[PDB]
Design a protein around this ligand. Structure first.
Ligand SMILES: Nc1ncnc2c1ncn2[C@@H]1O[C@H](COS(=O)(=O)NC(=O)[C@@H](N)CO)[C@@H](O)[C@H]1O
Ligand SMILES: [Mg+2]
Length: 409
């Protein structure tokens, strides 16, 4: 009796998905269909268990049950990807970003009142007056948002990368530079569906008529994607992990949904560098490591003396993989606001189950920005500006051969 009535256990999982999907403001539409296909998959699986282990020529009904079950097994698995990860209980339940929960704030806001004068400028106005970047000729060669890095733009970019990578290595992180493009089947298991339409550049195979074949390549939007897919069909023991990765790479993003938004300077671009945190933990250690990864990012920007605030993103705005995401918004005197510099998410076993990173039980994947070089430079520039030039943060001065100040060209 209770054996068949164990459907309470299966119905209890559908309840947790329903509560999370409602908090994501997804309307529980894809969920109601997944419940029906799951039963029909259980109906087809029970028929496929017709072992026939003992003059019946039923050997023709066996291929009919196998292929028909796979036709519904792929339809059922295609829906389990559209369902978002179950949110954690302390996630703000709201559909607008104006309800993002501010957790803590560090640093006093500077006295710069951006008005277009040399004493208070926007990041693009300072960097263009310092010969940092070239967007006129960069857009001529690569289209909108294209740019060159020049002079101390390259020097500060290299200095900030060394200080960022060294920051994680001193905390026991493992340095890693991944491939900058991935194949279709691997990228599909690491990136959301919206990433393909909005973000990922597509390099199709020759003579494929531009279609997405199995040999299609996609440039990485972050080192999170190749480092996550790096654990494909990998089993790890409790003695092997936790693993902390210090990823560094260039990032390619189409920004197709950010049309017209932030097009001056190098705040939002198609190509940028980023030093990344990626951690593989036990399910028990996931929440403890998530708070560690965000405090490491807090510590990094405290040493840059950039005021910031750490907020928790609302439920209706999260990606499908995040069970909870923390954002570090640093102070930009130009925009007179806090602007996003670091995202730190606890994805639990969303991608690891897709990638079959077994421990059925799976590992928990977490990712977090440490420093997006190009955008952090925009924040450094707006805070360390003077009417006579740019000041260099003390932590970066050793990496720049000792320079303390840069005058306007
Ligand atoms: N188009 C862009 N141009 C410049 N910097 C960007 C761009 N897109 C994102 N960034 C920077 O990169 C950070 C991380 O981007 S994210 O997609 O939000 N998060 C990730 O990629 C995670 N893997 C954590 O790093 C952002 O907070 C921002 O500082
Ligand atoms: Mg983000």
């Amino acid at each position: 009796i209770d054996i068949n009535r164990i459907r309470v256990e299966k119905g209890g999982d559908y309840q947790k998905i329903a509560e999370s999907e409602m908090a994501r403001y997804k309307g529980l539409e894809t969920l109601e269909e997944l419940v029906k296909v799951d039963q029909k998959w259980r109906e087809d699986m029970f028929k496929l268990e017709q072992s026939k282990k003992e003059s019946v020529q039923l050997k023709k009904n066996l291929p009919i049950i196998e292929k028909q079950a796979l036709e519904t097994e792929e339809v059922r698995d295609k829906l389990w990807h559209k369902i978002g990860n179950v949110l954690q209980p302390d996630v703000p339940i709201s559909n607008t970003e104006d309800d993002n929960l501010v957790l803590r704030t560090w640093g006093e806001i500077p006295d710069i009142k951006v008005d277009g004068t040399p004493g208070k400028l926007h990041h693009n106005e300072i960097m263009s007056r310092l010969g940092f970047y070239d967007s006129v000729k960069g857009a001529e060669l690569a289209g909108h948002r294209g740019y060159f890095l020049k002079d101390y733009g390259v020097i500060m970019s290299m200095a900030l990368s060394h200080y960022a990578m060294g920051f994680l290595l001193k905390k026991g992180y493992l340095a890693i530079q991944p491939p900058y493009f991935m194949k279709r089947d691997l990228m599909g298991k690491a990136a959301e569906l919206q990433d393909f339409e909005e973000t990922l550049y597509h390099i199709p195979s020759d003579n494929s008529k531009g279609e997405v074949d199995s040999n299609s390549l996609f440039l990485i939007a972050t080192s999170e994607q190749p480092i996550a897919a790096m654990h494909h069909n990998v089993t790890l023991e409790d003695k092997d992990l936790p693993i902390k990765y210090a990823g560094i790479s260039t990032c390619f993003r189409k920004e197709a949904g950010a049309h017209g938004k932030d097009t001056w300077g190098i705040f939002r671009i198609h190509q940028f560098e980023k030093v990344e945190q990626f951690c593989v933990t036990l399910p028990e250690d996931s929440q403890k490591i998530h708070e560690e990864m965000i405090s490491i990012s807090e510590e990094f920007y405290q040493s840059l003396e950039l005021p910031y605030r750490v907020i928790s993103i609302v439920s209706g705005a999260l990606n499908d993989a995040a069970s909870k995401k923390y954002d570090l918004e640093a102070w930009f005197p130009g925009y007179n606001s806090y602007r996003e510099l670091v995202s730190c998410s606890n994805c639990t076993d969303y991608q690891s189950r897709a990638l079959e990173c077994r421990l059925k039980h799976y590992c928990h994947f977490l990712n977090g920005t440490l420093c997006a070089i190009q955008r952090t430079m925009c924040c450094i520039v707006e805070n360390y500006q003077t009417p006579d030039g740019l000041r260099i943060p003390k932590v970066l001065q050793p990496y720049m051969n000792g320079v303390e100040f840069i005058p306007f060209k």
